[PDB]
Amino acid sequence: AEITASLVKELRERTGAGMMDCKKALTEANGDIELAIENMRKSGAIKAAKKAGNVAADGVIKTKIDGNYGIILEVNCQTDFVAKDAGFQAFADKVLDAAVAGKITDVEVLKAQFEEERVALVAKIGENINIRRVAALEGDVLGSYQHGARIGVLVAAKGADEELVKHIAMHVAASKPEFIKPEDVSAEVVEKEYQVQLDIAMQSGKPKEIAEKMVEGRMKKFTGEVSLTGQPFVMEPSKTVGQLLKEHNAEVTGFIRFEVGEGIEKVETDFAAEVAAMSKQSHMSFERTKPHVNVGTIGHVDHGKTTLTAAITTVLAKTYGGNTSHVEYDTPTRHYAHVDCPGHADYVKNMITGAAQMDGAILVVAATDGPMPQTREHILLGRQVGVPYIIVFLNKCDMVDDEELLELVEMEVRELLSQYDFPGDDTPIVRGSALKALEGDAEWEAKILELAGFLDSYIPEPERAIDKPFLLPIEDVFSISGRGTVVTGRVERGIIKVGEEVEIVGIKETQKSTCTGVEMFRKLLDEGRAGENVGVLLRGIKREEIERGQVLAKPGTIKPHTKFESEVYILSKDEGGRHTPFFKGYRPQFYFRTTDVTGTIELPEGVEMVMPGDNIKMVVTLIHPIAMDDGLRFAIREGGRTVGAGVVAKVLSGASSRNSLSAQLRRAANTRIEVEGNLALSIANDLLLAYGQSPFNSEAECISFSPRFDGTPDDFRINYLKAEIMSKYDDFSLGIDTEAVAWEKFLAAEAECALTNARLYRPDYSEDFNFSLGESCIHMARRKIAKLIGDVPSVEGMLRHCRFSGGATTTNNRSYGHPSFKFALPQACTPRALKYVLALRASTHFDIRISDISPFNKAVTVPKNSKTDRCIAIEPGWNMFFQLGIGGILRDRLRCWGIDLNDQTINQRRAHEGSVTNNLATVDLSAASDSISLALCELLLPPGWFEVLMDLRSPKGRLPDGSVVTYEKISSMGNGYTFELESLIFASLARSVCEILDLDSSEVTVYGDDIILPSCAVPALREVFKYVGFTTNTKKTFSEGPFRESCGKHYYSGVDVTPFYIRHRIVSPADLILVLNNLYRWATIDGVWDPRAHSVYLKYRKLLPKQLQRNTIPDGYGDGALVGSVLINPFAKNRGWIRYVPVITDHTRDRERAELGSYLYDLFSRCLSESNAIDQLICRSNPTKISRSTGKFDIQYIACSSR
RNA sequence: CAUAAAAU
RNA sequence: ACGAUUUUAUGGAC
Ligand SMILES: Nc1ccn([C@@H]2O[C@H](COP(=O)(O)OP(=O)(O)OP(=O)(O)O)C[C@H]2O)c(=O)n1
Ligand SMILES: [Ca+2]
Ligand SMILES: [Ca+2]
Incomplete structure (x- = not known):
């Protein structure tokens, strides 16, 4: 003392x-x-x-x-x-x-x-x-x-x-x-x-x-x-x-x-x-396969959150090896990204908008003060955002001349923690000093080390994508002659082997089937894995009974729900969102993994208006089911405009x-x-x-x-x-x-x-x-x-940029200009060009066919001026x-x-x-x-x-x-x-x-x-x-x-x-x-x-x-x-x-698309992809639809504001 | 990709 | 047998 x-x-x-x-x-x-x-x-x-x-x-x-x-x-x-x-x-x-x-x-x-x-x-x-x-x-x-x-x-x-x-x-x-x-x-x-x-x-x-x-x-x-x-x-x-x-x-x-x-x-x-x-x-x-762990720092403005993140970095640097406004530091067994939590609403926003989740927070309080009154509100943020684990770093412990006084602070924070349902008695607490560490001092320096151990040991390793039960969000559905139904998408999690049975769940009543095969543009596969774009073939199930927006998943692992509570963020004017508030009966589109689905919502008791910029809890009930479990992110849209983000908080x-x-x-x-x-x-x-x-x-x-x-x-x-x-x-x-x-x-x-x-x-x-x-x-x-x-076009280059995206070719008129018909109908090709086609053919198991092998193109005429x-x-x-x-x-x-x-x-x-x-x-x-x-x-x-x-x-x-x-x-x-x-x-x-x-x-x-x-x-x-x-x-x-x-x-x-x-x-x-x-x-x-x-x-x-x-x-x-x-x-x-x-819009009749062609087009694109605030990443690319234009006009209702 | 508007 | 490129608003984004 x-x-x-x-x-x-x-x-x-x-x-x-x-x-x-x-x-x-x-x-x-x-x-x-x-x-x-x-x-x-x-x-x-x-x-x-x-x-x-x-x-x-x-x-x-x-x-x-x-x-x-x-x-x-x-x-x-x-x-x-x-x-x-x-x-x-x-x-x-x-x-x-x-x-x-x-x-x-x-x-x-x-x-x-x-x-x-x-x-x-x-x-x-x-x-x-x-x-x-x-x-x-x-x-x-x-x-x-x-x-x-x-x-x-x-x-x-x-x-x-x-x-x-x-x-x-x-x-x-x-x-x-x-x-x-x-x-x-x-x-x-x-x-x-x-x-x-x-x-x-x-x-x-x-x-x-x-x-x-x-x-x-x-x-x-x-x-x-x-x-x-x-x-x-x-x-x-x-x-x-x-x-x-x-x-x-x-x-x-x-x-x-x-x-x-x-x-x-x-x-x-x-x-x-x-x-x-x-x-x-x-x-x-x-x-390079170490798990990513997201940690946040949180506490009193001048208690040392920042100087601590320095220490965490210099010291981890010195010792072990070595999307914006964050830091990343490395542990022999793990990799860390670390955000500061300088405000409650800012954080809640980022955690909604997926732009900063958290695997654990570290709560920093100075021992010279002990917890502040508002430390309670810090811990309350943790509880409300659902942070799974909280570790405490007692700071500035050198400026405390009495060990029994450290015991005192330590036990206050254990009570506040427990007051908010966190494991008070069991939470790691570290008596240390940010300053001494960065200025070198093995003593206090080893405490930073001690804290990082508590990251490696107390925050459990987050479940790797591949380790979760199979789920593939369905982007399109193809009926293919003498193979059956195939769906395409990127597999969100897990693994699907041919053989295994699958459930298809979402819009209509759920259905079951079995995986007949799995393919990409280049090769047929035994299994599709997490993060891979694949086609998946299904036994028996007809094409007209599968829709985009449904999911494919291992049976009983995901369920169709219509009602649920969520936390949402309405974007500001300034962020391309709405410019005017909404009220009781807001009715936008909810875009889930791959599709809009309309739904009504009920505000929480006491709120009657919502304006661009707001965080809000709301209860959304959808016009028809969708496969969800809490955790699932979704966007809020008005006519293809994104005006909100949210996460399902609890299914009802x-x-x-x-x-x-x-x-x-x-x-x-x-x-x-x-x-x-x-x-x-x-x-x-x-x-x-x-x-x-x-x-x-x-x-x-x-x-x-x-x-x-x-x-x-x-x-x-x-x-x-x-x-x-x-x-x-x-x-x-x-x-x-x-x-x-x-x-x-x-x-x-x-x-x-x-x-x-x-x-x-x-x-x-x-x-x-x-x-x-x-x-x-x-x-x-x-x-x-x-x-x-360079002396020559690279293989990488060509493999990245060759594609059909077209209008008319020597074989297809404008009617058949869409890329999918290029993969369907055989295309002409030039004598010197034949090698390039042959090489494409040897790179894929799909048929690549040449109509006629000729040196000619068609010179034609298009309008210009009078x-x-x-x-x-x-x-x-x-x-x-x-x-x-x-x-x-x-x-x-x-x-x-x-x-x-x-x-x-x-x-x-x-x-x-x-x-x-x-x-x-x-x-x-x-x-x-x-x-x-x-x-x-x-x-x-x-x-x-x-x-x-x-x-x-x-x-x-x-x-x-x-x-x-x-x-x-x-x-x-x-x-x-x-x-x-x-x-x-x-x-x-x-x-x-x-x-x-x-x-x-x-x-x-x-x-x-x-x-x-x-x-x-x-x-x-x-x-x-x-x-x-x-x-x-x-x-x-x-x-x-x-x-x-x-x-x-x-x-x-x-x-x-x-x-x-x-x-x-x-x-x-x-x-x-x-x-x-x-x-x-x-x-x-x-x-x-x-x-x-x-x-x-x-x-x-x-x-x-x-x-x-x-x-x-x-x-x-x-x-x-x-x-x-x-x-x-x-x-x-x-x-x-x-x-x-x-x-007024141009009136159009529907027209038959080419099934193989579109499917080829689809896969070929996913391949292309693979070789080349920020929540746009909740949308995709669209199913091919062919249509003839009659010369009449049609009226169509569109969403609009003033931007 | 493209109906559509500007355009090389 | 109206094209190759860009682009933006709408719709393949129900
Ligand atoms: N189907 C077309 C039409 C035009 N262009 C591109 O347009 C470029 C130049 O044409 P303009 O600048 O628009 O004018 P010019 O036709 O070359 O001649 P002028 O100025 O006398 O009209 C080159 C050409 O590749 C093209 O790529 N594909
Ligand atoms: Ca010009
Ligand atoms: Ca010119």
Whole structure:
């Protein structure tokens, strides 16, 4: 010991002060009881001093009302945990209560008649605790609501009633409006937004009245949203609060809403680092099958959770061997991942959302203090989250000069533990010190070792996947001639051997069968194991009696349930979730392992609203059964949107849309808009007329107009529109116009490849004295290409990227374009290509069949613009299959040149920069794909690659004409690699031009033939291009002026001037809706209409069937409806707190899929997979369904919000 | 993959 | 015998 005093517990269990704070204030007073107590009071206020320097951004909010008087209180603290401690609840309650009767408003008066008690609590708790906001509200009627303790509101209303103010109070907590009426916004607070935003618009060049009217309309909006009155009432968001009030003759005097920790920043905490940051101040000085164990750390803010995780790491490092914001450390027998548990709600969330489960927590309390009041709430988290085991690490034991005092702390924590049903008497407890360990000290250092032993020994080894009874979630079901039914999926756990019997359980009543076999794409297997994608064959059972969503499992091991309790997390707006709350009868979709299943739910007694961001317990009952046991995770969905996650906590027992309205909309959709003449053109001219631009004289001018690259952006925007809008219209009369044009072009490109083939094959001119830019780039480009690409396409590469994913082949028309028919019907293949097919055949037990072995592809024609079609090439199926292989590998490799072919936004953005800086140019070639000659390829690519490219192309072509060509080009568009190969050729030449001019290669960026490189380089690029056979398109390439375009976006001095195109004669209501939408999107800023165009929009709107004028959807939901405000829409049905609106879709008949083919396709894909917040990982890929498109239209109801 | 919208 | 690539919204995600 050290003390002339031993029993400090009496001092403690009447103060709540730390053990040492106790024995030190006792030692220094000869050891007098009532005396020491007082001595501590004094020293108290001074300890709360370092508290101030602790950001207390948590806490609670309280509200009390007495007939007419109501007050709302906000008192802060540092954690979730103390926020729900009884102690802290009492203080805040008292301050609340003793602030109602004594109607206080001056915070400071309140913050002062309590200050002596404040320090009292702080001292005990050891956390900063400051009272904060306080306000009062009086009204002829007022009511309150609070949302747990995170948000409280006061609502005051005249001429209102009781239920009515509950509801408004709930709404205020949901939509947090700043003002009570749109007219309350400081007639100046806004005037700023209007002087500032009138320029935003006037600087686009929009003529005053236009920018003015837009900013006016824009602000009318800006105001109504942030004001109670013009906010869609959350309990029925079709009518607003203003309108809601007025139907109750009611008015709202005013409202208060406080939210815990509003406008307190709260510097973020990165745990993983914070720890590694201490493992530095001291670290300076097959057996890969070890089980993964997840541990959490949890305790008082400054008791040492972090410094301990350091010690755990340095020491385990020194001694033994050696998804974010965690740490991992290694034990000779196990592997650990370790999270901190800094808050109760944050943890509960992560444990729901599977983003941090726990095999055991380690509870860290400092022995100098002993357990704190809120330690109880730490342990309570453990119990509520179901942590299986809790180990205790007593910390800072050196600063305790009396062993018997350690015995005291130790026994307090054993009681709290047992108070919450944990094994108190048997729980490992370690008297140690984090500090001494990290600063080296075998003594205290061996205690960390002792704790880690307690991890290896006390936390039981978690059951390995393969050791659990077999379960495979069923993704699809195939009837296969002369084999029977096979299901596919990834086996979730265990092992299934052929022979063994299986139960199939889920949607319908359970069934039994026996495993006839198990197969993957490559081989047949004896057994399927955990984590393997397989097909499983079943005896007897017919295909029509198995559904996706059911499971396959060892009998009696899993059961079908409909009712159950769960813990769930509703995602925030900010996380792509819902943006509005739900209530009693929420009715979403519950996605289990592989399928949605609808279900109702009942909230827990006392909660009536749920908002994005909430944790919540709810009782879900499903419309039909699903195989579950507690532990099972599921997602919450609204029309394929994920808005929640949950886990089944305990299985229980337990067990809208319109007709005519639907029918009316369909009738209308199937109608035909009728007009005199060319409706597209009428719209276009009316549009030009509203913008003070001259109309189109004739069909012939529509396609022969050129914009002026100058003028203000606004004046250029409609002008360019004018030149683009009708430019691809396929229904013009006047024109000896054909596709004769396309084939002439097709013949011209071949003739150029002919020339360049002759040319380029001739490396020695006459006498080696004369040097050329073109020659030099080919030499430079080549060298670069080889370092990027290798001598040869790898087997790994090809095995990862070869696939069918298609449309039409030389054997299958578009009807049979789906990959599954490629595996079903035999595909053609080229003489040189035959080896590749043979190799596929020797790699699998399934039949791989060649239809006919020929050198030909089919040259055909597809629409392009009003002036010409464009010829493409339908390849032999097996050729395509491998072409996609090298296509896929070049895609991977091009990433090192900072070129990313799965993303055209990097080209769009550099197009934009270019229109501002003029330092980047956008360049276009003409028949780009058709101009890559054989010769150019053989000089640029490694021989190995070239041979592989030459095996894989179609060497010959067959025109619709009936004639043939022997291709002078390497390949055309339609071929599986053409596009990546252009990219490579174009990039390598441009990059070579950069080196030669002393510019960064990395400034080069390419997407097919949209090319962007520094402007200075264009003249030389033009020269190289001429040399190697390309013709650059002067009209589409810009290395100066204010205009740039790349990948479909067009810019003029930074402003977007991307046009829209009317491609077809408009006949159905859907066609009209397409055009009006494209016009919406072109002429709208943030939903607000440029007025010039709005007049045209309204005019042609009238052409639609009456009902389709009102059927509106938000932007970003397609074109089966007019884009506009969906809250206004009369056809929207709000069913179960999810809003559903009708949209026109293409009507389709069902069609027979190919069973083997689809099954092959399925397995082939799973193979592909195997060789190449974050809770998306609860969904899959979908069963193949073929369908024919009739030309009628159908109406379909879809979920939508406003995102 | 693809009906659909932009697009190379 | 309308294609190869990207992409986003809807549906093969009942
Ligand atoms: N079925 C198709 C059609 C086009 N493309 C790709 O588009 C690229 C270039 O074509 P565009 O840039 O759109 O224009 P071009 O047809 O080459 O000619 P122009 O600019 O004169 O219209 C190359 C080609 O691989 C393709 O891969 N497959
Ligand atoms: Ca081009
Ligand atoms: Ca282009």
